[PDB]
Short mmCIF file of C-alpha atoms in Angstrom, two decimals:
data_model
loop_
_atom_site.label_atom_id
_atom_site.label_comp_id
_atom_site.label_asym_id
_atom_site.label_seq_id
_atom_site.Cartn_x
_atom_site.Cartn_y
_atom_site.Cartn_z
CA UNK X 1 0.00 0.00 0.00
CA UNK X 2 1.30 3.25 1.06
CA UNK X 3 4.83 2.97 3.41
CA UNK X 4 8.21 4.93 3.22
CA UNK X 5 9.63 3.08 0.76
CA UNK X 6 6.18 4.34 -1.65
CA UNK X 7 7.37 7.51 -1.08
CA UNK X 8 11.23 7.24 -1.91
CA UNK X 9 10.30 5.66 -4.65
CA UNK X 10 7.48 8.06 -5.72
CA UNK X 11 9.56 10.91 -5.35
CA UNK X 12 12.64 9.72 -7.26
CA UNK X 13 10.25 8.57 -10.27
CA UNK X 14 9.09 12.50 -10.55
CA UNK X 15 11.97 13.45 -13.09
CA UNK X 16 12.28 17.20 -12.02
CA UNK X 17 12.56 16.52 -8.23
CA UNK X 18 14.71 13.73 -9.11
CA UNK X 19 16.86 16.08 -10.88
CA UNK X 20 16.57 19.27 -8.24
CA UNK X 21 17.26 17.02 -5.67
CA UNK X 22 20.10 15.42 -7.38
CA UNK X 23 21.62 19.24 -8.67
CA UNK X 24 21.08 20.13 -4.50
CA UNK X 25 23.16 17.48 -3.83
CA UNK X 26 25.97 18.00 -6.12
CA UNK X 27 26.57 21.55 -4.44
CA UNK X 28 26.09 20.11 -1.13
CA UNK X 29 29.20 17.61 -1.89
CA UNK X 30 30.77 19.86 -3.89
CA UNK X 31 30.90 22.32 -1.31
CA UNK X 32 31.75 19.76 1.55
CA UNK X 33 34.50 18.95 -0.57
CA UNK X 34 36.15 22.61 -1.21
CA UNK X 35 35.78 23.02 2.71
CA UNK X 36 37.85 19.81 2.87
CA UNK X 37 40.41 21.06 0.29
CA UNK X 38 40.98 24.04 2.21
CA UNK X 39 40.91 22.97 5.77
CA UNK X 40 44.03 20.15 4.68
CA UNK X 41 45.61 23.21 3.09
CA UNK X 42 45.61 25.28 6.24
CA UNK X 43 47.49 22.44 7.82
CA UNK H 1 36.28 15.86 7.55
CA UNK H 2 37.42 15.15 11.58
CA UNK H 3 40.30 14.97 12.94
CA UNK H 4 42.02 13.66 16.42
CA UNK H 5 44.25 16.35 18.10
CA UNK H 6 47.44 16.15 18.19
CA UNK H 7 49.34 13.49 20.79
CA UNK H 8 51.14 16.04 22.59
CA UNK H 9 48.41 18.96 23.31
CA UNK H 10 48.20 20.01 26.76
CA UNK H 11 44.23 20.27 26.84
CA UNK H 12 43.67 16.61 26.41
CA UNK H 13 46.34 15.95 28.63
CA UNK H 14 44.50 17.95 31.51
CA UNK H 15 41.18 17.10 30.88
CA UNK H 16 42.36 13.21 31.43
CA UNK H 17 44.27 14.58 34.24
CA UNK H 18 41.17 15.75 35.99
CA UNK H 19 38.44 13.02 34.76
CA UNK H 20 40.62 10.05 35.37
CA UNK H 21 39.96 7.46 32.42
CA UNK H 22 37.28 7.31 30.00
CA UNK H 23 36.77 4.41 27.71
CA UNK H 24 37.95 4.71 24.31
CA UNK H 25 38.43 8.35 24.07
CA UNK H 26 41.42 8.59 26.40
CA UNK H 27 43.90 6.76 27.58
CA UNK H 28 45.75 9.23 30.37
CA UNK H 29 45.14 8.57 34.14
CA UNK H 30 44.87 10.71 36.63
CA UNK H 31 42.69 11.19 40.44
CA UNK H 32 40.18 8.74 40.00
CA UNK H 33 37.70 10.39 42.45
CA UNK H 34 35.97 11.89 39.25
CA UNK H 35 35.41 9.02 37.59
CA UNK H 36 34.00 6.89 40.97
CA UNK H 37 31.71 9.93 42.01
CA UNK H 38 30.01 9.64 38.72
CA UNK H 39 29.59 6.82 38.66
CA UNK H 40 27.60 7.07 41.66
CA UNK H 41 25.95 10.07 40.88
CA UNK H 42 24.87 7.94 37.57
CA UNK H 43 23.25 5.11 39.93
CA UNK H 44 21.58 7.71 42.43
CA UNK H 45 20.21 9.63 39.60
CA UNK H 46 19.26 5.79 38.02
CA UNK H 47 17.43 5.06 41.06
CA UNK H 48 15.68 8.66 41.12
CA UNK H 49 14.90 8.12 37.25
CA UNK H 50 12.90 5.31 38.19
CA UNK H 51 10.82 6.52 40.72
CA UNK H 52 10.27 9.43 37.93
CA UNK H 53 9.32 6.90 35.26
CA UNK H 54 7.12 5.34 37.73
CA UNK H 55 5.05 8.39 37.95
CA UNK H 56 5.06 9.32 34.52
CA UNK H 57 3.68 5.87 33.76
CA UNK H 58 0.80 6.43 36.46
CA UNK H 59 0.16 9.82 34.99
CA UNK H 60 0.17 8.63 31.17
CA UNK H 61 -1.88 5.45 31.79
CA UNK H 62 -4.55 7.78 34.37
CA UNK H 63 -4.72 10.70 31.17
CA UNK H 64 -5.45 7.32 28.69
CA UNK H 65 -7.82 5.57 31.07
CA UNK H 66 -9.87 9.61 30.46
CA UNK H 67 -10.29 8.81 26.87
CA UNK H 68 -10.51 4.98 27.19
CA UNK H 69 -8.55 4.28 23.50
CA UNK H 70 -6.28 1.07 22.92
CA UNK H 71 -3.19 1.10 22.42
CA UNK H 72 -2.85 4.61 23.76
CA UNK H 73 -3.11 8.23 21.65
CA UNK H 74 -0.64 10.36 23.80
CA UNK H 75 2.58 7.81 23.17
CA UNK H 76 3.72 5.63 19.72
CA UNK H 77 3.64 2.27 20.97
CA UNK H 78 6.17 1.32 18.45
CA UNK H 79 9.07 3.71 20.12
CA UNK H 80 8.64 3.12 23.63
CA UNK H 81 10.89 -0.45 23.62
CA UNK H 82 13.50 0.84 21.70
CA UNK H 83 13.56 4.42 23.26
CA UNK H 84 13.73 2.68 26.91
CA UNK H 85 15.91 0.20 26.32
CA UNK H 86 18.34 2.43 24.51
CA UNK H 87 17.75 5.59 27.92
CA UNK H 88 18.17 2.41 30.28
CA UNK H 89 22.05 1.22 28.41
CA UNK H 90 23.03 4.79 28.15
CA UNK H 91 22.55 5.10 32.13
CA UNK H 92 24.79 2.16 32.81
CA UNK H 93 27.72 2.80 34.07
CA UNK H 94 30.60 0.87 33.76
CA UNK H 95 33.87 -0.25 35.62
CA UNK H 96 35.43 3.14 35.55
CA UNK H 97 31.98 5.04 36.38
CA UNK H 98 31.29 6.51 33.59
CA UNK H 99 28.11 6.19 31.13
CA UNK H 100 27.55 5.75 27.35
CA UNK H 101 26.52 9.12 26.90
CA UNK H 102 29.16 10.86 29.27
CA UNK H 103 31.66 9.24 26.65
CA UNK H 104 29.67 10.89 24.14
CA UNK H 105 30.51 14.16 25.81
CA UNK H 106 33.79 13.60 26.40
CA UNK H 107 34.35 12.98 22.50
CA UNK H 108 32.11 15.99 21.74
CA UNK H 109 34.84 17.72 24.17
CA UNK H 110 37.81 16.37 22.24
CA UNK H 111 36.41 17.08 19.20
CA UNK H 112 36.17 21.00 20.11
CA UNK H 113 39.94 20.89 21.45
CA UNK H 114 40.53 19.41 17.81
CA UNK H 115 38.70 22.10 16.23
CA UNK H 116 40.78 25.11 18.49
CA UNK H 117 43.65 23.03 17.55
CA UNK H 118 42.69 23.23 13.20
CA UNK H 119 42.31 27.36 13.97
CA UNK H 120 45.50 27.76 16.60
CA UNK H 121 47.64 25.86 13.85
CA UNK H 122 46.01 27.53 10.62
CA UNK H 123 47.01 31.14 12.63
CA UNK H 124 50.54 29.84 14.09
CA UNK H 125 51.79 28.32 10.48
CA UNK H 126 50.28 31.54 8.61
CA UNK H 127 52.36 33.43 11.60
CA UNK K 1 55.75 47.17 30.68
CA UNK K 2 54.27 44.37 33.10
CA UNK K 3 50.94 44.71 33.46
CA UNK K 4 50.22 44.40 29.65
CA UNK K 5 52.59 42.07 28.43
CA UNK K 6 50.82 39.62 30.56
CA UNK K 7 47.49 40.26 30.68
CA UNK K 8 45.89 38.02 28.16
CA UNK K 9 47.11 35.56 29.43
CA UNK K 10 45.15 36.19 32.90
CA UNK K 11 41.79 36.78 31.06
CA UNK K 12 42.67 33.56 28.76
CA UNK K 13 43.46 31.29 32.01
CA UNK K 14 40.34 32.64 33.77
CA UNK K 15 38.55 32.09 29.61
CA UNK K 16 40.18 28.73 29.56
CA UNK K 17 38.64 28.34 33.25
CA UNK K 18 35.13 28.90 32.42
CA UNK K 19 35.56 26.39 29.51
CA UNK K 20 36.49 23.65 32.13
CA UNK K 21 33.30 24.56 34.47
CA UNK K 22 31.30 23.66 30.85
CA UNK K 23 32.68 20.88 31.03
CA UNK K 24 31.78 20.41 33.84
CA UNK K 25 28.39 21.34 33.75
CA UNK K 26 27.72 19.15 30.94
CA UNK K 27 29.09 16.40 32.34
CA UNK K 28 26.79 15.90 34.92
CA UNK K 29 23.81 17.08 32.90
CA UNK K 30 24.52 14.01 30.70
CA UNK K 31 22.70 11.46 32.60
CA UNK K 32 20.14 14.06 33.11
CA UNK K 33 19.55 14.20 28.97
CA UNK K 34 19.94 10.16 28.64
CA UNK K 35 17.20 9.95 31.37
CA UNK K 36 15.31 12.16 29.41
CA UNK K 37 15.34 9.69 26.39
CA UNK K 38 13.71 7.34 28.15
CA UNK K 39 10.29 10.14 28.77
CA UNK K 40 7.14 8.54 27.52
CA UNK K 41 6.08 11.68 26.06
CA UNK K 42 5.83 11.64 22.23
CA UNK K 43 7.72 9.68 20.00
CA UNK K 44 11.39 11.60 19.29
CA UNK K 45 14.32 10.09 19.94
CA UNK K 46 15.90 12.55 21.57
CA UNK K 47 12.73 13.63 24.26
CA UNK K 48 14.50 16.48 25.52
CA UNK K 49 16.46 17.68 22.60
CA UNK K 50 16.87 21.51 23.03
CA UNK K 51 18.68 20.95 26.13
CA UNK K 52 21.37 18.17 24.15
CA UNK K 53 21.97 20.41 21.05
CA UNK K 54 22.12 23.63 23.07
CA UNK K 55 24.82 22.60 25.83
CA UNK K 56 26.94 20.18 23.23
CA UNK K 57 26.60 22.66 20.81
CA UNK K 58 28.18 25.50 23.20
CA UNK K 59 30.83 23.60 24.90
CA UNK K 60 32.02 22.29 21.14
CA UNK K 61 32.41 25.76 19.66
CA UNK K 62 33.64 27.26 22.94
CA UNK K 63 37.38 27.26 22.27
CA UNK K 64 37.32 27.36 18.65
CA UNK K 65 35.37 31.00 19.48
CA UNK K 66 38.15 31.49 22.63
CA UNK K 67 40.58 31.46 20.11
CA UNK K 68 38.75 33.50 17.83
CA UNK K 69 38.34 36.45 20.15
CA UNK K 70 42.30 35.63 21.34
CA UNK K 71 43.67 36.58 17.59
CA UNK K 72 41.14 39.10 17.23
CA UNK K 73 42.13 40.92 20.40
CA UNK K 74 45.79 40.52 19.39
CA UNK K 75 45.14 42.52 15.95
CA UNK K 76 43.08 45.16 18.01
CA UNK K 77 45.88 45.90 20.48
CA UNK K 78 47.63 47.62 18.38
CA UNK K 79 44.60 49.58 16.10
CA UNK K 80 43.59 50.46 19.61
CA UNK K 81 47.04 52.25 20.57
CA UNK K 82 47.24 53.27 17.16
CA UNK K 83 43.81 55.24 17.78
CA UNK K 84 45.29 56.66 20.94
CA UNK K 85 48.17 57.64 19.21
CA UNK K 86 46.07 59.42 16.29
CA UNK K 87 43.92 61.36 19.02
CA UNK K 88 46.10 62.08 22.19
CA UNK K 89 48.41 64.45 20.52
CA UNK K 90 45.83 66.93 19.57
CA UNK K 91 43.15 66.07 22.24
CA UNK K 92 46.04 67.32 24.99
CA UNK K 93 47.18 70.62 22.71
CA UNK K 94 45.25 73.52 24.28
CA UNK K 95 45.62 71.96 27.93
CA UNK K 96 49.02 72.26 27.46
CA UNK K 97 47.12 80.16 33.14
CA UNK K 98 48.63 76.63 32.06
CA UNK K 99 52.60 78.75 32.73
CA UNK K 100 54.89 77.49 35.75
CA UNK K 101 53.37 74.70 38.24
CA UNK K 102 50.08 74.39 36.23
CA UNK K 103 52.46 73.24 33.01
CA UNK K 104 54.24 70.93 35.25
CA UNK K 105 51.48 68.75 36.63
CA UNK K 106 49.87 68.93 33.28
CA UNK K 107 52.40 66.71 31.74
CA UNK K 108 51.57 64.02 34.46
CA UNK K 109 48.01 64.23 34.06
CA UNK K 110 48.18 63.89 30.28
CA UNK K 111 50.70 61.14 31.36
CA UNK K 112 48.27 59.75 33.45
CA UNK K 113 45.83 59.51 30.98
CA UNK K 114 48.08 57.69 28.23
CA UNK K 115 49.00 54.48 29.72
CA UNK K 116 45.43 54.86 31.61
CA UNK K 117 43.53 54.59 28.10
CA UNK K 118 46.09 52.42 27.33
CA UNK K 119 44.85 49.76 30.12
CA UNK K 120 41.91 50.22 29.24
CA UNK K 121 42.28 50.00 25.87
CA UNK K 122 43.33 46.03 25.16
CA UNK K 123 41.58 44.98 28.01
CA UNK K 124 38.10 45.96 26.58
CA UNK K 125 39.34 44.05 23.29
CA UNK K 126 40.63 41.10 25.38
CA UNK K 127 36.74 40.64 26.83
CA UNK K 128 35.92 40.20 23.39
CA UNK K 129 37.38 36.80 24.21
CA UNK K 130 34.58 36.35 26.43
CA UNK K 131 32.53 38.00 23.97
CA UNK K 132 32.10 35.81 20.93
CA UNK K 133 31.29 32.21 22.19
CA UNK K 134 27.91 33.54 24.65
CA UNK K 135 27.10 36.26 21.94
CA UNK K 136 27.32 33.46 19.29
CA UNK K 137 24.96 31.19 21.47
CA UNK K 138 22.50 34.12 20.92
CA UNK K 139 22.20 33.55 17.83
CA UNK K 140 21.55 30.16 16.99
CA UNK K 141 20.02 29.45 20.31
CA UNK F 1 -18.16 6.69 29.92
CA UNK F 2 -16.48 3.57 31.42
CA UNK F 3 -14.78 3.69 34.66
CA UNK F 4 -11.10 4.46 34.65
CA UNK F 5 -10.99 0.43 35.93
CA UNK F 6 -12.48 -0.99 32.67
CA UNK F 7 -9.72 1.38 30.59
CA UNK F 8 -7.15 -0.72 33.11
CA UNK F 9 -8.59 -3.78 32.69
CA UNK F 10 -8.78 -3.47 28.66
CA UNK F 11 -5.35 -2.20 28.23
CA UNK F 12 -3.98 -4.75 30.61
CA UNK F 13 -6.06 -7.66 28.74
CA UNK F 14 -4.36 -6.73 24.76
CA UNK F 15 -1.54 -9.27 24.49
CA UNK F 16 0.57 -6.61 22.29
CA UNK F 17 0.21 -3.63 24.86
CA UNK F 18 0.81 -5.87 27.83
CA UNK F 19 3.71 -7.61 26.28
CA UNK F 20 5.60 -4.18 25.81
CA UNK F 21 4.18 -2.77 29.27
CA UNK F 22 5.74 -5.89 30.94
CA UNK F 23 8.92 -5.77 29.10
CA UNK F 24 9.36 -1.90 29.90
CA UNK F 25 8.59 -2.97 34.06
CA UNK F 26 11.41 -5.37 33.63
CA UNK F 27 13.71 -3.13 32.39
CA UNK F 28 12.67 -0.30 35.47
CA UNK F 29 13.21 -3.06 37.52
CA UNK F 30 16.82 -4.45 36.44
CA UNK F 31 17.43 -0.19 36.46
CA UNK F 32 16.62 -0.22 40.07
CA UNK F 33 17.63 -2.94 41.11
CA UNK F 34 21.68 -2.33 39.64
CA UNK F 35 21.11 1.81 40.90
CA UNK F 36 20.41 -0.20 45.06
CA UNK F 37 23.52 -2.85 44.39
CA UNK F 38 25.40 0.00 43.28
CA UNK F 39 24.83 2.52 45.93
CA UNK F 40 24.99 -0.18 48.89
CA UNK F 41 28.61 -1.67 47.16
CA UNK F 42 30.23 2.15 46.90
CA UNK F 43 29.31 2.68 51.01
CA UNK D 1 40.96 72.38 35.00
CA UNK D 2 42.23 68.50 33.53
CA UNK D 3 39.59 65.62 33.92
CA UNK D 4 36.90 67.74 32.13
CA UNK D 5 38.92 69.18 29.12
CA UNK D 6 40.10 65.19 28.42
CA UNK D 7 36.84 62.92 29.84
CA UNK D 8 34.55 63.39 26.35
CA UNK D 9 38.07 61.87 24.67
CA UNK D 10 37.67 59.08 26.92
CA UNK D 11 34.39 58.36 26.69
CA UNK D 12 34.54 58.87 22.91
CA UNK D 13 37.22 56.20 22.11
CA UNK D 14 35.45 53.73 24.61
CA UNK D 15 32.04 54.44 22.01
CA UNK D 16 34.37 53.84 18.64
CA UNK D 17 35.32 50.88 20.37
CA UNK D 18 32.43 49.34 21.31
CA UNK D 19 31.94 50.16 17.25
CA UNK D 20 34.76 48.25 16.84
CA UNK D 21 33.95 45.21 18.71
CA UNK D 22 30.41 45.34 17.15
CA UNK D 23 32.03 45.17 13.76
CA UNK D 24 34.01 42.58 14.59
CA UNK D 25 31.13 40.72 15.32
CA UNK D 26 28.98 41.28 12.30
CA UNK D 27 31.75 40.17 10.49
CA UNK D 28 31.96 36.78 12.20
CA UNK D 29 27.88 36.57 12.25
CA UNK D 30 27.95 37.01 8.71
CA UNK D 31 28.58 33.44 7.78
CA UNK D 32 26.04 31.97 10.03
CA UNK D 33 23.20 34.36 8.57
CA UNK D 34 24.70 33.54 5.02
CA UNK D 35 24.43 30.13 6.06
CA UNK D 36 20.71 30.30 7.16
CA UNK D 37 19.78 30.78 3.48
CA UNK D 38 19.37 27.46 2.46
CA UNK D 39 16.39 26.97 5.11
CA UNK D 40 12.89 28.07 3.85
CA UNK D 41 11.83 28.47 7.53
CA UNK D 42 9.43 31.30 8.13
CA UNK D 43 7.65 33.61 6.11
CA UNK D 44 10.89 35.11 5.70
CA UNK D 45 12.14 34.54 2.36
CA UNK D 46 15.74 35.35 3.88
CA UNK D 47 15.45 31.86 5.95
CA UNK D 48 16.86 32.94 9.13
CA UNK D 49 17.32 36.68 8.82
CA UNK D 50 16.28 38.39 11.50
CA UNK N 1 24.84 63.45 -3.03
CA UNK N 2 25.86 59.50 -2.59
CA UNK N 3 27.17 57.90 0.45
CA UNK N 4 30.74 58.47 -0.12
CA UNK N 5 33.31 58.90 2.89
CA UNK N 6 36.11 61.17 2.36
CA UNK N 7 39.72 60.05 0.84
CA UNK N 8 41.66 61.30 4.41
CA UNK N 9 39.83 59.78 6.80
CA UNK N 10 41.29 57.29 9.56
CA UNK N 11 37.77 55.22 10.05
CA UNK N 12 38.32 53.00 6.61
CA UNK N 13 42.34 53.80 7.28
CA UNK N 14 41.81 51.11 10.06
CA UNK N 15 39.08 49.18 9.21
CA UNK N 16 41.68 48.15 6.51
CA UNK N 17 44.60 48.30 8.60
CA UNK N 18 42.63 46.14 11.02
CA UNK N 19 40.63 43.57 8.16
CA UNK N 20 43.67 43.59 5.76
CA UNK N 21 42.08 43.88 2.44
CA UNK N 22 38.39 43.09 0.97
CA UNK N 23 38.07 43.07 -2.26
CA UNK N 24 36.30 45.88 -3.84
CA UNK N 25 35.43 48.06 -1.29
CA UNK N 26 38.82 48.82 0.54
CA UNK N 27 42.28 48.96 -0.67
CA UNK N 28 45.28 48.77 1.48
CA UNK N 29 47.19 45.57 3.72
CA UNK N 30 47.76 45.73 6.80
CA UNK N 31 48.60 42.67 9.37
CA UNK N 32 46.48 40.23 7.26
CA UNK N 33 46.55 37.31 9.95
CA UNK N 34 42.72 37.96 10.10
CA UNK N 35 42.78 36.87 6.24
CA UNK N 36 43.34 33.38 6.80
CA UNK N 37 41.64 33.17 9.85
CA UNK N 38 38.22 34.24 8.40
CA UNK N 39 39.21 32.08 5.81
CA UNK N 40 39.81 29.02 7.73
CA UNK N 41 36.64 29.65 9.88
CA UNK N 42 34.75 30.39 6.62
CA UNK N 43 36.27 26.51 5.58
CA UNK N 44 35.26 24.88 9.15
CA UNK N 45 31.79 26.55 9.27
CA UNK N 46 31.31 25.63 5.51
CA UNK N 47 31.94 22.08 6.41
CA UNK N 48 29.83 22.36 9.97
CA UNK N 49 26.91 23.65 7.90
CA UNK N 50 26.89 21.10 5.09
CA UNK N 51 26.78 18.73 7.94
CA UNK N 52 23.79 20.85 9.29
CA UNK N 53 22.26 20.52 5.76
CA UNK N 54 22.36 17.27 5.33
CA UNK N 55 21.06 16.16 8.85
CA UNK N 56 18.18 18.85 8.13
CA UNK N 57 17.41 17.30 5.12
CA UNK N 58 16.87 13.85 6.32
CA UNK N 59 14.67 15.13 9.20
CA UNK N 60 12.77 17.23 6.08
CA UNK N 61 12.52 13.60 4.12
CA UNK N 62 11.80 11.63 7.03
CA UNK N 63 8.80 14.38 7.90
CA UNK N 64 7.22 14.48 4.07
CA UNK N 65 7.20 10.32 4.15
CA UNK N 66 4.80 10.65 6.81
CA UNK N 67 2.41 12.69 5.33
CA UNK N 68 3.07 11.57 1.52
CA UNK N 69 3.55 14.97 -0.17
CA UNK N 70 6.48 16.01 -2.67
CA UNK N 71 9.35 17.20 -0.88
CA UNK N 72 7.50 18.43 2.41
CA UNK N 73 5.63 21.43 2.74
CA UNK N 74 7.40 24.57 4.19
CA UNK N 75 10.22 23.52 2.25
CA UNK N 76 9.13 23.63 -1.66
CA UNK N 77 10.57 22.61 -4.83
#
C-alpha cells in the first residue's frame, strides 16, 4: 500500500525533483568537498 | 572531515588529568575520584529516574484511562521499547563510572579541542 | 611594561577556566539528557532535545570562538594604541594660566591619561574573548 | 463513559500492549535494582 | 581644569570601540546568517534573517 | 549626493589596517593574519553547515514520508 519506501520511490520517479534534488546534492558535496580542500591546506 | 588532536596537546592531557579514564576516548590517568563519584551520581540519579518513570507511567496510563482508547493516543507504541531500552544502556555505568553518553561528551569535548587546535595551527603556520 | 605584556594571558586562564566549568556542567547534565530519552512523552528520539543540542553545541564551539576572540584581540591591540596615538596628541594641545606649576602637573596628568587609556584599551578588546562564544549562542540558540 | 478500571482492565487484557508494558517494568526493575547494588557496594 | 577638558576623549574612544567590537562581530555573524539561506523556515524569504 | 566617505579619513584607514584587504570596497594591507583566519573559519563553518544541511534534510525527508507529499511542505521545490 502506502509505506516509506512508496514515497522514496514516488519521489525519485518525478523526473524534475529527481533532478533538483540530485543538482542540491551536487553543491552540497561539492561544497563539503572545497571546505575539505581548504581545511588540509591550512594544515 | 574530523580529525584527532594532536598526541602532545596540553588540553587533552589535563582534561584526562582531571576526569581520570574514559573508555575509548582517552587513555591518560589521573585522580580517579571523578570518575567513581560519577559513577555514583549515575546510579543515584538511576534510582531517582525510576521513581520518575514510575510516575510518569501512572500519569500517562490515568490521562489514557480519560479517553478509554487502545493502544494509547498520547505515546507511539512502536518507540517506547526501543527508546527505553536504549535511555536504560546509556545510564549504565561501567567499571570506571562513567556512562555511554558521558563518553559521548567527552568525545564531543575532544572534538572541540581538535577544532581550536585546526584554527590555533592555521594562525601559528600563517604566523 | 608588566601589566600588559601579561594580561591576556590572565583573562585567557580565567577564559580557559570557564571552559572547564562547561565541562563540567555538561558532564553531569549528561545522565540528566539520557534519562530524558527514556520520557514517555511523544515519540522523538531525543525527548529532551533543546537541552542536548544547546549545551553540546556550546561547549564544542567554545574554544574554537576562545581562540577566535584571542587573535582578534591581538590585531586590536595595536589599532587600539594606534587610535590613541592618532587622538592624544591633539586632544592634549590647548591643555598644554597653564605657565609654571600648572604646566608641570599637566604633563603628568596627560601622562596619566596615556598608559590609563592604554589599560583600558586592550583589556576591553581582550573581553571580546569572552565575547564571541555567549554572543554566538544568541544567535543560533 | 467507562470507569477508569475498565480502561485498566482493557489495556492490561491486549496481548501486544501488555507484552511491551511488561517488558518496559522489567527493564525499570533491572534499572533499580543495579542503581540499590550499586549505591549499597560504593558505602 | 584636567579631567573635564580630556573625559569626552575618553568616553569617545570607549564608544568607537564598542563600534569596533560590534564590527568585529557582524563580520563573524555574517557566515552563520549567510548560512541560514538554504532553510525556507518562516515567512521570511531570507530563511533565518532576523 | 551619494554615500561616499572622504579620501583622508582614519575610520576605513583602520578598518583596513585592522581587516587587511576586501576586495572591492577597501584597498590597502595591513597585518592580514585575520585573512586566513576568516578564511579558515569560513572553511570549518562551511563544512559544519553542510553537515547541518544534510542532517536537516533527512529530518525534512523523514517528515514528508509521513504525510506523503512532494518534498515536504514549508520547504518547496
Amino acid at each position: 500500500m502506502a509505506s516509506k519506501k512508496e514515497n522514496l520511490k514516488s519521489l525519485f520517479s518525478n523526473t524534475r525533483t529527481r533532478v533538483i534534488i540530485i543538482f542540491t546534492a551536487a553543491l552540497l558535496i561539492i561544497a563539503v568537498v572545497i571546505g575539505f580542500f581548504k581545511i588540509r591546506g591550512a594544515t | 572531515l574530523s580529525f584527532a588532536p594532536p598526541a602532545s596537546d596540553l588540553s587533552v592531557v589535563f582534561l584526562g588529568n582531571l576526569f581520570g579514564v574514559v573508555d575509548g576516548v582517552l587513555h591518560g590517568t589521573g585522580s580517579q575520584i571523578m570518575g567513581n563519584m560519577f559513577g555514583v551520581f549515575n546510579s543515584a540519579v538511576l534510582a531517582l529516574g525510576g521513581i520518575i518513570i514510575m510516575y510518569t507511567l501512572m500519569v500517562s496510563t490515568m490521562n489514557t484511562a480519560h479517553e478509554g482508547q487502545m493502544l494509547g493516543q498520547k505515546w507511539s507504541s512502536i518507540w517506547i521499547p526501543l527508546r527505553s531500552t536504549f535511555g536504560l544502556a546509556l545510564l549504565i555505568p561501567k567499571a570506571s563510572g562513567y556512562c555511554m553518553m558521558q563518553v559521548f561528551f567527552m568525545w564531543v569535548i575532544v572534538q572541540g579541542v581538535g577544532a581550536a587546535d585546526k584554527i590555533w595551527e592555521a594562525a601559528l603556520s600563517y604566523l | 611594561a608588566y601589566y600588559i605584556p601579561v594580561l591576556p594571558y590572565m583573562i585567557f586562564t580565567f577564559g580557559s577556566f570557564a571552559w572547564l566549568i562547561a565541562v563540567i556542567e555538561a558532564m553531569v547534565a549528561a545522565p540528566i539528557v539520557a534519562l530524558g530519552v527514556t520520557h514517555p512523552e511523544g515519540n522523538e528520539a531525543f525527548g529532551k532535545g533543546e537541552f542536548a543540542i544547546m549545551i553540546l553545541v556550546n561547549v564544542f564551539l567554545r574554544p574554537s570562538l576562545m581562540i577566535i576572540g584571542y587573535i582578534a584581540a591581538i590585531a586590536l591591540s595595536y589599532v587600539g594604541v594606534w587610535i590613541l596615538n592618532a587622538g592624544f596628541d591633539h586632544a592634549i594641545s590647548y591643555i598644554q594660566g597653564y605657565t609654571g606649576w600648572a604646566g608641570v602637573y599637566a604633563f603628568f596628568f596627560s601622562i596619566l591619561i596615556y598608559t590609563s587609556m592604554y589599560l583600558i584599551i586592550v583589556q576591553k578588546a581582550f573581553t571580546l574573548i569572552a565575547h564571541l562564544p555567549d554572543k554566538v549562542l544568541r544567535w543560533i540558540g
